[PDB]
């Protein structure tokens, strides 16, 4: 049937899936879907900032 | 800057005049791309206006 297998895809479908993925992930831990504020995003970005800061210092050592 | 500095510590000192024109002109291109990045405007919302 439709939707199965490795067919083609578009850039609006890629972001569309990430929205549904966030909204369902929130329902498993907070049991509500109002989502006036979206903390999953922020807790993830804090890790990406942590990794980036580690790499900046790492390259700083190689420069010296 | 790191790429430029690393060459001086090696002593090749190829920069100055003829050589410096590349990093000098190359530096402008980066700023020109960030300027297009902040593109648009006229929204004019601000804490002091609200």
Curated annotation (Swiss-Prot), chain A:
Transmembrane segments: 47-64
Localization: Cell inner membrane
Superkingdom of origin organism: Bacteria
Cytoplasmic side: 1-46
Family named by the database record: Belongs to the EccB family.
Annotated function: An ATPase (shown for residues 80-506). Part of the ESX-5 specialized secretion system, which is responsible for the secretion of EsxN and a number of PE_PGRS and PPE proteins, including PPE41.
Note: Part of the eccB5-eccC5 operon, which is essential for in vitro growth.
Subunit structure, interactors included: Part of the ESX-5 / type VII secretion system (T7SS), which is composed of cytosolic and membrane components. The ESX-5 membrane complex is composed of EccB5, EccC5, EccD5 and EccE5.
Name of the protein described by the UniProt record: ESX-5 secretion system ATPase EccB5
Record lineage: Bacteria, Bacillati, Actinomycetota, Actinomycetes, Mycobacteriales
From Swiss-Prot, chain B:
Transmembrane intervals: 15-35
Superkingdom of this protein's organism: Bacteria
Disruption phenotype: Mutants are defective in the secretion of EsxN, PPE41 and PE_PGRS proteins.
Cellular localisation: Cell inner membrane
Function, in words: Part of the ESX-5 specialized secretion system, which is responsible for the secretion of EsxN and a number of PE_PGRS and PPE proteins, including PPE41.
UniProt subunit comment: Part of the ESX-5 / type VII secretion system (T7SS), which is composed of cytosolic and membrane components. The ESX-5 membrane complex is composed of EccB5, EccC5, EccD5 and EccE5.
Note: Part of the eccB5-eccC5 operon, which is essential for in vitro growth.
Protein name stated in the entry: ESX-5 secretion system protein EccC5
């Amino acid at each position: 049937g439709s939707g199965y297998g490795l067919g083609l895809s578009t850039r609006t479908q890629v972001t569309g899936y990430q929205f549904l993925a966030r909204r369902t992930a929130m329902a498993l831990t907070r049991w509500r879907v109002r989502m006036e504020i979206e903390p999953g995003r922020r807790q993830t970005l804090a890790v990406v900032a942590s990794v980036s800061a580690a790499l900046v210092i790492c390259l700083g050592a190689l420069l010296w | 800057g790191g790429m430029v500095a690393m060459v001086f510590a090696s002593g090749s000192h190829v920069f100055g005049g003829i050589g410096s024109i590349f990093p000098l002109f190359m530096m402008v291109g980066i700023m020109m791309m960030m300027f297009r990045g902040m593109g648009g405007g006229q929204q004019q919302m601000s804490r002091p206006k609200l």
